[PDB]
Each structure stands twice: as structure tokens, then as C-alpha cells.
């Protein structure tokens, strides 16, 4: 429609149909629009009564919603309907091919209908021309469309012809379904059951188990109610239950029918009342199951008259035998199920603890299926599910572009992974896909589970009782197989990476020398049982995973591989006496593997289980790139009194693995000049860089930042990071915001690239709004730039996810670190790309700050009991960092950067001070006063255990930005302050002021002093650091009150105003945090003069139109406001920031 707003403009109207003409009327357009709206409203009512009548008189039209009926009306008249429509029609017939549908549409029409609509199409134009105005012609078109619709649309079936085609398909694939009710339930009324939330789904599996050897139900005959279940499919279930036309007797269940909304339940019960008044069958097996702890909701409190005192309950191995009997795919079908437990079509691969066998079990079955069915083209779809509240629309959207194509229908394995963070959607999804066999978009396509694929679901472990219903694989750790139940996979056993450590630790366990052994690449006679037990001896863990034994074996593989490719084996061959060396190599790499491959409130207890810090021994021996040398660090070698050489840690007499090497080997390493027993703190910078780049394998070093200190701890951290993604272990690091993790990783990347300006480190700031799509896209584009950097410069690339813990998509990061996968597709091993993840520690605020935050203004809106933002029982408001739970298999991989030390804290504060407010003209003495004052503020705030950021150097860089603003304006602010103090005070407050010292007092007032509540303590702590005029708390206090009075006097004058300290503070902070674009958050009681400060600031902060000379030198402010309701969408906040950017 087009509507002309002109005087005598009118309405133009165009149905997109070839037998209708364009309608056009002129006149006053408001009455035309009113008449047109009334007419289309009446037509909407008529259409709703017509479609209700057509659904009442055609049964099988009730399987489908309105949009699904539109899709099938569009598609069945087409000569080759889409496979989505045939999936949708395989619930009426089953195995519905295109020829059955040709027969069903051809056996549907009669010729009387044809020439009746031909008479209508030849009668209609004379009937339109008899109506003069557009209302009359339109009324004729709408009435003829109601009664005779297929004439207007000669390419879609109307609901009559569609309903007859569906009822004709239903008769072709016969053998209907006959189900009896269980005893206790009557077969002519509702049957209410109240049974408790963990019993609704197995009790339903009793009601259908009373007729075994009958196929399992589907989206008809069972509706799983949910909140945000619409009224349409509830009514469609009631239509399918309370109408005649069916061929068998079926049950019709509303499961969880108290989960429905109030409106949906009210509409559902009055629609049930309407369908039981008008016309129905008196055989309706309507069974309703509600949560018995939720009887107050509208469906059980309404239908409590038809309440059954008994709850049907079948035993567990009966339901297991029932579902396994229906999952038993027969032979000669060419299924993917053949390689599961002799054709079982549905699995659950589960475990108790992570990192054991689950994805390896699925990939093992996949190679088994490729080997049995003689093709390498069998697809394995991996559907990663990571969001909490499992969305079936995601699984459905991953299934539709796969398998509606009819291409490799006979084998497909689907690998549906539920991660550990999917806490609130699981049994409904598994009940629909694995038992009810479908997934549905109610305005779209309907998926059915094909008996002929293999849907393997991988779930970690109220839910354990449900998961026992299915044919379940339980994977075990290597300790729990060798006693209860070969455990080691035969492909991994004959792998090279499990074979060098096994063929070395086998010769090492019985004390054989290793003088003339170079592994001879190819599998030894070992068994995987003895391979497993030789790895279980030397790992040090008492109950390891398989991730941990793989990490142990890969570390020893990389170290012994570098040991075989050095000069020392051949030098012991030539010189004939260096023997005993490889025993030393094996013993020391067991020490290093103890460091790397191993670890080891009630809710923060598994995550704050950092039993070790960086303040622990780190004895490292590396072999260099392909050099003739070694690299010893983190330990010294001292001679024991019993004839051997022991390894101790530096600056401490504490032995670490006594008797690693004898005097003969130690003297032989003296004679070969290896760098053993060398201090790394009393050396200059070039020699430290030489030792790093000899250990890191960098030829021709170039120092990227000579200010970054190479203390021996940073040496050990760089060698730890480089070793972990040298051997293949994931790198995830738990540090705070203050530790130099990103600076160390930037130093490592810039040291390794040397001089090329190619982008090597890409830092990704993970935050709470980081969706999985961002992580997936960033990892695959970083992999593209990784391939480009390795092709051009032969250079490795690092992708650093900083604070990769604060999103609920942290499972995605586990996917990229542990099992090397981006949303299903594999990462490339020859790419050259190393993902580092960093995470925040999991500590809780002090109870003083928790009771302070709860009492800030009003309360919180949502209390700490009803808060859905939680880790365990702890709300995230009370945690110091807003972190979510680490996925297991990443807990045994995190390790600790050290926290910070004051020598390399004050030096970084001095670098920030000399960088941003640089000493071009301040002083050197004044910059060390600034640096000492900021250091005193940071060490003040650390001497109370309650700060949310764990205040860092970013706050210090912000605070010298505040200082730089005040110093660039301490030419007119001090003049205007002198005017104000001469007008309104005595001669005491009239001295001349130092614009560097004054601006430091003001930066302290804005940054640190305003936020605190114990301000006198902070002023006395910081007054021990200033020079002469501000040595007291009184001096800093009255100085900042003079300037708060100054900014409030420069505002337009107010009377009858609460001119207290709170208004002065709010106006002062608001002016300055607007000028510097620091975000400010004011919270108080609802009469606290913080709205008054907003009006005063916006009034005073005009650019040249301001009242005073002070605010005429500041900026001009335009405010855009947005009031946050509790039902506020995040699109409104984005809209307001874009509106400010437009201004
Ligand atoms: N039986 C085995 N023998 C040798 N190695 C194994 C075995 N099982 C697993 N692994 C190793 O464990 C590593 C991780 O195991 P996998 O990813 O299959 O466990 P998962 O159960 O999928 O872990 P998660 O619980 O995190 O999903 C794999 O790289 C594999 O090499
Ligand atoms: Mg897995």
C-alpha cells in the first residue's frame, strides 16, 4: 500500500496477484485509513474463524503451526518439494518420498473445484466493477478470498486441499499407533499428575511404556512445556487430542505444564473448555504432568478436579531396555550405528572428571566407521554447546544446513558436546532429540532424528539419574581402569610421542645405562599396560587424567628429542668417557616435568587452589636450538659428601632431588664448558639477552625494550611459556591486573620477531560481553595472519586472550586450548600460532566491603539470595573479580605469575610519571615527588584487603592524566582561586601556590580521595610524602575544599539550596570527570544532591555561554540521558552512545 499525505491524496493498493487489479481512491486520507484499518480488522476476525473451522474439520492440519502450514502450502504444489518439507511430512507418513506426495496431491483434487474456481475467476471482474469505491471492491476481494481462496493464489494449496493431501498421506504409510492408558488414569477426561521435578520425565516414560514395541512419540502426542512456550502449539496439542480423523489411539501429554506462563495457561484452559463444549472425541488420553512443588500455578490449580492420586512409575532397567530396544537399528540399513554397541543409534559419552576419553572415544568410533565402510568421507559433525541455558535453536541451526541435503544419509556421526557451563537446559533437549526424536522451529523447519545416523552426546558430570536412561559410555582415568576394569589407546601407544619417553623410562626403571641408545624410531615391544604403569610411576600425580599423562609424555618427548639432536651423545661416543649423561638427562627432565606437567569458601576452593606460587623451585635444563650447548637456570649444582652432585635452589640451602649426577659427569661437563651453576642477577643486560636468545633459539638478538628488567624470575617465566608451547602443553596463566603478564608476553613476542614490523602478538581483551562468535572469528583470523607470518617471515604468532575468564564463553577458550578446535573445525599444527590465555584469581571481597556495598544508597535491587549472577552460592557482586568458573581440563593447566614486588612497582610508577607528564618542564625532583605520592597511595590501598580492581598501574596512568589536566590549567585555575580566596576568605588562605605541588594535591583529590569513606586516614598517610605546604591532613583537606567551593561558585547562583559538602563534591567530580572522559558513578539515597549536581554541571559547563570566567575556559557539554528501567534492553544503551557520537 501507498498512502499519499497530500490534500486529496488518497490510498493506492496492490495485491501482488495477476487476477486482481490495483485499487486507488482519493479523499481525506485519515478517514480512508480509519475505514481501511476497520475493514482489515474485521477481515482478521473472519480469517481467524475460518482457519479455526478448517483446523476443526481437517485433523492432520494440526501438526503444523500457521507459518509451517504456509511453508507446506507453498511447497507441496511445487513439482519437487524441498527436503525440509519432506522432513516435516515424515511425521504424518514416515519415509515420505516425492512420489507418495505426487500421489497424495493428485488424489486430492476434483474437477468440480476446478471449474468452480474458474467460474469465480471469470465472474470476479464484473463483480468488482459493480462496486464504485475502494472499500466496496476490497470488501468483495476479501469475501471471495475467504470462500474461494485457491483462485486468488494459483500456486499454493488452500487449507482444504492441503488438509486433504495430509489426510491422504496419512493413509498410505499404514499400521497406526495404539496406546492404552495405565491404570489409575481415565480415558475420557484430563489426567493430572503431580510428581516432583525430577520425576516428570521418567513418569512420562512409564505412560508410553505401557504399550511396548510401539514406536516412541514425537512432537505430536508429547508437548514439553517451558516458559516461553507459545499458546499456538499448546492449542495444537489440544486439537490433536480432541478431534476425530486419526487412525490409532495415542496419548497426549503436557509435560511440565505448570512451566507455562499465566496468560498461556489461561488461554489454554479456556480453549480446552471451548473444544470440550463444541465437538470432540470421548476417547481423549490427555495426560498432564506438573511439578508437585508448583501446584499454585494456573494449570494444576485449575485442573485439580481431574487429579490422579497415583504417579506412574516404571523401574529403571525396564526403561533402559525400552529405549535401547527402540535405539537398536537393525542390520542391512547402512547406518553409522554399526560401530557403536552393535547398532545403537544414540549414545551418551560421559565421565566424572575431565580429560579422560570422551572426545577420543567419539573420534575412535569415527575411524572405526571409516575403516568399516571403506571411505574416508564419512562426516563427523561437532556441535559445541557452551552457553548456559542450552538453546535448541542452536543445535537445530547447526543441523539444518548439514543434512537436509540428502547426500551422505547412510553414515553420519553427530558429536554434540555439552560443555560444563550449560547448567540449565539439558534434560529437555535430550528428551526431545533422543526420545521424541525431533527439534522444531515453530515458524520453520522440523528436524527428525534419523535411525541411521549416530547422535553421540558428550556430557560431563539430579542430572545423573536422567543420563542413566540412555545407552551410556563412561570413561575412566588411568588409575580407575587398572584396578576396576588395555586402557591406553593403541594409536597413542604406538605414537612417537608416547614412545621416546616409554623407551627411555623403560631402560631407566631397571637401572640400565643409556650410553648407546638412540631410540631407533619405531615402536618397541611394550605393552600399553606397562607403558601406562611406567608413565604412572614418573609423573608424580597420584590420580592423573589422560590430559596430564599426555602432557607429561609430550614434555619428556620434546626434551629427549632435543637431547638426541645435540652434540653431547656424539661427543660421548668420540671421547669415550662422558657416560652417565643420559641418566642425568632423564632424572632432571622428570624434575622439570614435575614443574610443568603437574599441579599438586567451598565454592572458590577448586579455583583458588593455587597451592604453589612462582615463589617455588623452578629448576630448568634446556638444550638449545640445534647448538652444541645447554642452558641451566633456576638451580645450582653442589657436590654432596657421599660422592655425588646435588641440585639446590639459589640463595637458599635446600636440596632439590639429591644425587642427580656423579663427580665424573660433573667434571666432564666442566671440561665441555656448559653454562652450569651461573648467577643470573649479577650479570649485565647483553649477556642475559644472549642467554635468553640462546635458549629461545633466536639468532642475532635485538633488545626490544631495555627498560624491561630481565631478573631471573622473568627469565624463568619466559622459558616456561616458550617450553609449554614448544612441547605442546596449553598456556593459561592466573595473574592479577598488576603483575607484568602482558608486558612479559609483549617482550617475548617483540624479542622473537627481532626487527620485522609484522604483527605477531594479537591481544584480545575478553570481557563480559564477549560472545563465542567473537572468540571463534578472532581465532580464525589470527590463524590466517599466522599462516601469512610463517609464509613470509618464518615467524611464530601469538594470540593472547587477556583476562580470558570474565566471559561466560570461557568454555570456548578451553576448546581452543585443550582439544585444538574452532567451533568444530580443527586448528592446523603446521600453522604456527600459539594461544595464551590469562585469567583472574577467584577471591571474595572482605565482609566490611560486602556490608558497605550492600548499603550503598538503597539496597541492591535484586538481593544476594535471588541473584542469578552467581559462581556457586556466591554472587558475582561479592567476588573481587567478576569471573566465571574455569572449565575443568583448564584447572590443572593454570599456573601463577608472581603477584608484584615493590622494587618493580615503584620503578614502573616512575616510568609512568616520566612518560605521560614527562620531565621536559616539570623538574626531576618534582617527578620523584609525584612518583612517591602515587606509590604511597597505591601502598595505602593495598593495606586494606578490599578493593575491586586490585588497583593497578592503569589507575596510576589515569591519575597522572588528571595531574596533567590540572597542570595545564594551573594558570587560570590558580588565578581564579586567588580571586575567590581574596573575595571570600581571610589573608591566611592567600599564599602563592606551586602549580606542580598544587596539581598533585588536586590529582590526589580527584583520583583517590573522593572515592574513599575514611578520608582522614588517607590524608594522614599521604601527608607524610608531600613537601612543605601540604604536610598535614588539614592542608590537603582545606585545599580541596577551597577548589570545590571555587567550582561551585563558578556555577550559576542558587538560593534555598542544600549547599552542603556532598553537592560541592559531586559538582567538582562531575566537571572533572567530564573534562577527562573518566566515567563517574554516583550512588546515594534519593535526596542526596546528585541530580542537582547534574543540572548544575550541565548548566555551568557551557562553552562560551557560561556565566563565569572559570567555566568559560572549560569545555562545552551536551548531555544525552537514558533512564535505566529493570526491563531495559542493551540496544538502548548502544543507541544512546551512538547518539552521543552523532552529536
Ligand atoms: N586412552 C588414552 N590413551 C592415550 N591418550 C589418551 C587416552 N584418552 C585420552 N588421551 C589423551 O587425552 C587428551 C584429551 O583427552 P580427551 O580430549 O579425549 O578427553 P575429554 O574427555 O574430551 O576431555 P574433556 O573432559 O575436557 O572434554 C587427548 O589429546 C588424548 O591424546
Ligand atoms: Mg571433549
Q: What single string gives the DSSP state of each residue in 460-479? A: E---TTTGGGS-EEE---HH
CA-angle at 711, arms to 709 and 712, nearest 5°: 150
What are the beta bridge partners of residue 549? Answer: none
d(CA 351, ligand 1 centre) in Å:
11
Number of other residues whose CB lies within 10 A of the CB of residue 205: 21
Candidate of 348, 356, 545 to mutate for ligand 1, largest count of ligand atoms within 8 Å of Cβ: 356
Looking from the CA of residue 528, the nearest atom of ligand 1 is: 3
Q: Which residue, 392, 428, 426, is CA-closest to 204?
A: 428
What backbone phi and psi angles, to 5 degrees, belong to 1097? -65, -50
Strands 413-418 and 23-25, bridge-based pairing:
unpaired
d(CA 1062, CA 1066): 6
Instruction: List the 644-648 sheet strands across, edge first.
Output: 636-639, 644-648, 655-662
d(CA 1077, CA 957): 14
d(CA 606, ligand 2 centre) in Å:
21
Residues of the binding site: 355-360, 458, 487, 489, 550, 814, 889
Q: Which residue, 552, 503, 719, 751, is CA-closest to 622?
A: 719
CB 409 within 8 A of CB 449: no
Ligand 1 interacting residues, C-beta cut-off 6 A = 351, 354-360, 460, 487-489, 492, 546-547, 550, 818-819, 889
**Rounded alpha-carbon distances, angstroms, from residue 363 to 453, 550, 591, 825, 904:** 15, 17, 33, 13, 49
CB 224 within 8 A of CB 256: yes
Looking from the CA of residue 417, the nearest atom of ligand 1 is: 27
CB 447 within 8 A of CB 396: yes
What backbone phi and psi angles, to 5 degrees, belong to 570? -70, -30
Q: Which residue, 809, 785, 808, is CA-closest to 795?
A: 785
What are the beta bridge partners of residue 25? Answer: 11
Q: Phi-psi category of 378—alpha, beta or left, where left has phi over 0 and alpha has psi -120 to 50?
A: beta
The 8-class DSSP code of residue 383 comes to E
CA-angle at 116, arms to 112 and 120, nearest 5°: 170
Number of other residues whose CB lies within 10 A of the CB of residue 1086: 8
Resolution in angstroms, to 1 decimal, for this deposition?
Answer: 3.2
Q: Which residue, 436, 470, 468, 429, is CA-closest to 204?
A: 436
d(CA 714, ligand 2 centre) in Å:
34
Residue 248 class from Cβ within 10 Å (0-12 exposed, 13-18 middle, 19+ buried)?
A: exposed
d(CA 346, CA 1010): 62
- The sign of the CA dihedral 472, 477, 482, 486 is positive
The per-residue b/e assignment along 358-379, b for 16 or more CB within 10 angstroms, e otherwise, is: bbbbbbebbeebbeebeeeebe
Kindly state the helix (H) or strand (E) to which residue 142 belongs, with its residue range. helix 134-147
DSSP codes, 162-205: HHHHHHHHHHHS------PPPTTS-TTSEEEEE--TTTHHHHHH
d(CA 794, CA 754): 12
Q: Atom 10, ligand 1: which residue's CA is nearest?
A: 546
Start-to-end Cα distance in the chain: 35
Q: Which residue has the cell 471471495?
A: 144
Residue 552 class from Cβ within 10 Å (0-12 exposed, 13-18 middle, 19+ buried)?
A: buried
Kindly state the helix (H) or strand (E) to which residue 978 belongs, with its residue range. helix 973-984
SS3 label, residue 630: strand
Angle between helices 546-564 and 568-575 (to 10 degrees): 50
What backbone phi and psi angles, to 5 degrees, belong to 839? -135, 160
Instruction: List the 380-385 sheet strands across, edge first.
Output: 380-385, 413-418, 454-460, 346-351, 472-474
Q: Atom 6, ligand 1: which residue's CA is nearest?
A: 546
d(CA 278, CA 49): 14
Q: Which residue, 539, 542, 605, is CA-closest to 891?
A: 605
* Structure-derived torsion over alpha carbons of residues 733, 735, 738, 739, reported in degrees to the nearest 10: -50
CB 124 within 8 A of CB 19: yes
Residues of the binding site for ATP: 355-360, 458, 487, 489, 550, 814, 889
d(CA 141, CA 20): 8
The per-residue b/e assignment along 99-137, b for 16 or more CB within 10 angstroms, e otherwise, is: ebbeebbeebeeeeeeeebeebeeebeeebeeeeebbeb
For residue 416, the ligand closest to its alpha carbon is: 2
Looking from the CA of residue 492, the nearest atom of ligand 1 is: 4
d(CA 356, ligand 2 centre) in Å:
9
**Rounded alpha-carbon distances, angstroms, from residue 929 to 897, 991, 1008:** 30, 21, 17
d(CA 388, ligand 1 centre) in Å:
24
CB 482 within 8 A of CB 533: yes
Looking from the CA of residue 478, the nearest atom of ligand 1 is: 1
What backbone phi and psi angles, to 5 degrees, belong to 639? -80, 125
d(CA 186, CA 180): 10
d(CA 479, CA 618): 28
d(CA 1111, ligand 1 centre) in Å:
66
Amino acid at each position: 500500500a501507498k498512502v499519499y499525505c497530500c490534500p486529496d491524496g488518497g490510498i493506492f493498493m496492490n495485491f501482488g496477484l495477476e487476477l486482481l487489479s490495483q485499487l486507488t481512491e482519493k479523499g481525506d486520507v485519515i478517514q480512508l485509513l480509519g475505514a481501511l484499518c476497520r475493514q482489515m480488522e474485521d477481515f482478521l476476525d473472519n480469517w481467524k474463524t475460518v482457519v479455526a473451522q478448517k483446523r476443526a474439520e481437517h485433523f492432520y492440519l494440526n501438526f503444523y503451526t500457521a507459518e509451517q502450514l504456509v511453508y507446506l502450502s507453498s511447497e507441496l504444489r511445487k513439482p519437487r518439494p524441498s527436503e525440509a518439507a519432506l522432513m516435516m511430512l515424515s511425521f504424518i507418513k514416515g519415509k515420505c518420498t516425492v512420489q507418495d506426495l505426487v500421489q497424495a496431491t493428485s488424489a486430492c483434487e476434483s474437477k468440480a473445484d476446478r471449474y468452480c474456481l474458474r467460474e469465480v475467476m471469470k465472474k470476479l471482474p464484473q463483480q468488482l466493477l459493480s462496486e464504485p469505491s475502494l472499500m466496496g471492491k476490497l470488501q468483495v476481494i476479501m469475501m471471495q478470498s475467504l470462500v474461494y481462496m485457491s483462485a486468488f493464489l494459483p500456486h499454493c494449496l488452500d487449507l482444504d486441499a492441503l488438509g486433504r493431501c495430509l489426510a491422504h498421506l496419512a493413509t498410505m504409510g499404514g499400521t497406526p499407533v495404539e496406546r492404552p492408558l495405565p491404570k489409575g488414569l481415565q480415558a475420557g477426561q484430563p489426567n493430572l499428575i503431580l510428581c516432583g521435578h525430577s520425576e516428570v520425565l521418567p513418569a512420562a516414560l512409564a505412560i508410553y511404556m505401557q504399550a511396548p514395541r510401539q514406536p516412541l512419540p514425537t512432537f505430536d502426542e508429547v508437548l514439553l512445556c517451558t516458559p516461553a512456550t507459545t499458546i499456538e502449539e499448546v492449542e495444537l496439542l489440544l486439537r490433536r487430542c480432541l478431534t476425530s480423523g486419526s487412525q490409532g489411539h495415542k496419548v497426549y501429554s503436557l509435560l511440565f505444564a505448570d512451566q507455562l506462563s499465566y496468560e498461556v495457561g489461561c488461554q489454554a484452559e479456556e480453549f480446552f473448555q471451548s473444544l470440550c463444549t463444541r465437538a470432540h472425541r470421548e476417547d481423549y488420553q490427555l495426560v498432564i504432568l506438573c511439578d508437585a512443588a508448583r501446584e499454585h500455578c494456573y494449570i494444576p490449580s485449575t485442573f485439580s478436579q481431574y487429579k490422579v492420586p497415583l504417579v506412574p512409575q516404571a523401574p529403571l532397567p525396564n526403561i533402559q531396555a525400552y529405549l535401547q530396544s527402540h535405539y537398536q537399528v537393525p542390520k542391512r540399513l547402512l547406518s553409522a550405528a554399526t560401530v557403536f554397541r552393535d547398532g545403537l543409534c544414540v549414545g551418551i559419552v560421559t565421565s566424572e572428571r575431565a580429560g579422560v576419553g570422551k572426545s577420543l572415544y567419539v573420534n575412535t568410533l569415527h575411524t572405526k566407521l571409516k575403516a568399516k565402510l571403506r571411505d574416508e568421507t564419512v562426516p563427523l559433525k561437532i556441535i559445541r554447546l557452551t552457553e548456559p541455558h542450552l538453546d535448541e535453536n542452536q543445535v537445530l541451526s547447526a543441523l539444518l544446513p548439514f543434512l537436509k541435503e540428502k547426500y551422505q544419509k547412510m553414515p553420519v556421526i553427530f558429536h554434540i558436546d555439552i560443555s560444563t557451563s550449560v547448567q540449565t537446559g539439558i534434560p529437555i533437549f535430550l528428551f526431545k532429540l533422543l526420545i521424541l526424536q525431533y527439534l522444531m522451529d515453530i515458524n520453520g523447519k522440523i528436524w527428525r532424528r534419523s535411525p541411521g545416523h549416530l547422535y553421540l552426546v558428550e556430557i560431563p558430570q539430579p542430572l545423573f539419574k536422567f543420563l542413566d536412561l540412555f545407552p551410556k559410555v563412561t570413561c575412566r582415568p588411568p588409575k580407575e581402569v587398572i584396578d576396576m576394569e588395555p586402557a591406553m589407546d593403541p594409536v597413542e601407544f604406538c605414537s612417537e610421542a608416547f614412545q621416546r619417553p616409554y623407551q627411555y623410562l623403560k631402560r631407566f626403571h631397571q637401572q640400565q645405562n643409556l650410553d648407546t641408545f638412540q631410540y631407533e624410531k619405531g615402536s618397541v615391544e611394550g605393552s600399553p599396560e606397562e607403558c601406562l604403569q611406567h608413565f604412572l610411576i614418573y609423573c608424580g600425580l597420584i590420580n592423573p587424567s589422560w590430559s596430564e599423562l599426555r602432557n607429561f609424555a609430550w614434555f619428556l618427548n620434546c626434551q629427549l628429542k632435543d637431547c638426541e639432536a645435540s652434540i653431547f651423545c656424539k661427543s660421548a661416543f668420540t671421547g669415550d668417557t662422558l657416560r652417565g649423561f643420559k641418566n642425568f638427562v632423564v632424572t632432571f627432565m622428570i624434575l622439570m616435568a614435575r614443574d610443568f606437567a603437574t599441579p599438586t569458601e567451598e565454592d572458590l576452593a577448586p579455583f583458588s587452589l593455587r597451592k604453589r606460587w612462582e615463589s617455588e623451585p623452578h629448576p630448568y635444563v634446556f638444550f638449545n636450538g640445534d647448538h652444541m650447548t645447554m642452558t641451566f637456570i633456576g638451580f645450582h649444582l653442589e657436590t654432596n659428601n657421599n660422592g655425588y652432585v646435588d641440585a639446590i635452589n639459589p640463595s637458599n640451602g635446600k636440596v632439590i632431588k639429591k644425587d642427580v649426577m656423579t663427580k665424573e659427569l660433573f667434571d666432564g661437563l666442566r671440561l665441555q664448558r656448559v653454562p652450569f651453576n651461573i648467577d643470573f642477577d649479577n650479570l649485565p643486560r647483553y649477556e642475559k639477552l644472549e642467554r635468553l636468545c640462546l635458549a629461545l633459539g633466536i639468532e642475532w638478538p635485538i633488545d626490544p625494550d631495555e627498560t624491561y628488567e630481565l631478573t631471573t624470575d622473568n627469565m624463568l617465566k619466559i622459558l616456561a611459556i616458550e617450553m609449554r608451547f614448544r612441547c605442546g602443553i596449553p598456556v593459561i596463566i592466573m595473574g592479577e591486573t598488576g603483575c607484568g603478564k602482558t608486558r612479559l608476553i609483549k617482550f617475548l613476542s617483540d624479542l622473537k620477531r627481532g626487527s620485522v614490523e609484522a604483527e605477531t602478538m594479537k591481544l584480545v581483551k575478553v570481557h563480559g560481553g564477549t560472545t563465542p562468535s567473537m572468540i571463534y572469528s578472532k581465532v580464525k583470523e589470527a590463524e590466517r595472519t599466522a599462516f601469512s607470518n610463517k609464509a613470509q617471515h618464518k615467524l611464530d604468532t601469538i594470540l593472547f586472550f587477556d583476562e580470558a575468564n570474565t566471559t561466560e564463553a570461557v568454555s570456548c577458550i578451553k576448546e581452543i586450548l585443550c582439544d585444538r578446535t574452532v567451533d568444530g573445525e580443527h586448528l592446523h599444527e603446521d600453522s604456527g600460532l600459539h594461544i595464551i590465555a590469562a585469567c583472574n584469581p577467584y577471591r571474595k571481597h572482605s565482609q566490611e566491603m560486602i556490608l558497605r556495598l550492600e548499603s550503598a544508597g538503597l539496597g541492591y535491587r535484586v538481593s544476594a539470595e535471588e541473584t542469578a549472577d552467581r559462581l556457586g552460592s556466591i554472587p558475582l557482586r561479592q567476588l573481587v573479580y567478576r569471573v566465571h568458573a574455569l572449565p575443568p581440563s583448564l584447572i590443572p593447566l593454570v599456573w601463577d605469575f608472581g603477584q608484584l614486588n615493590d622494587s618493580a612497582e615503584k620503578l614502573y610508577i616512575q616510568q609512568i610519571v616520566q612518560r605521560l607528564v614527562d620531565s621536559v618542564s616539570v623538574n626531576p625532583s618534582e617527578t620523584c615527588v609525584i612518583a612517591d605520592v602515587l606509590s604511597a597511595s597505591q601502598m595505602f590501598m593495598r593495606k586494606r584487603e578490599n578493593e575491586c580492581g586490585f588497583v593497578s598501574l592503569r589507575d596510576v596512568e589515569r591519575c597522572v592524566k588528571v595531574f596533567r589536566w590540572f597542570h595545564d590549567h594551573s594558570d587560570m585555575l590558580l588565578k581564579e582561586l586567588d580571586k575567590f580566596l581574596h573575595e571570600s576568605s581571610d589573608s591566611t588562605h592567600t599564599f602563592e601556590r606551586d602549580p606542580v605541588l598544587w596539581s598533585l594535591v588536586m590529582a590526589i583529590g580527584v583520583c583517590y580521595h573522593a572515592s574513599l569513606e575514611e578520608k582522614a586516614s588517607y590524608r594522614t598517610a599521604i601527608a607524610r610524602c608531600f613537601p612543605k605546604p601540604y604536610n598535614s591532613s588539614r592542608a590537603i583537606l582545606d585545599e580541596v575544599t577551597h577548589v570545590q567551593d571555587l567550582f561551585l561558585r563558578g556555577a550559576p547562583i542558587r538560593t534555598n539550596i542544600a549547599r552542603n559538602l556532598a553537592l560541592k563534591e559531586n559538582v567538582f567530580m562531575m566537571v572533572i570527570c567530564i573534562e577527562l572522559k573518566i566515567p563517574l558513578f554516583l550512588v546515594g539515597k534519593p535526596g542526596s544532591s546528585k541530580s542537582l549536581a547534574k543540572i548544575i554541571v550541565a548548566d555551568a559547563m557551557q562553552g562560551q555561554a557560561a556565566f563565569s570566567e572559570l567555566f568559560r575556559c572549560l569545555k562545552q557539554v551536551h548531555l544525552v540521558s537514558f533512564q535505566c528501567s529493570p526491563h531495559s534492553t542493551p540496544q538502548g544503551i548502544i543507541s544512546t552512545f551512538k547518539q552521543c557520537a552523532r552529536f
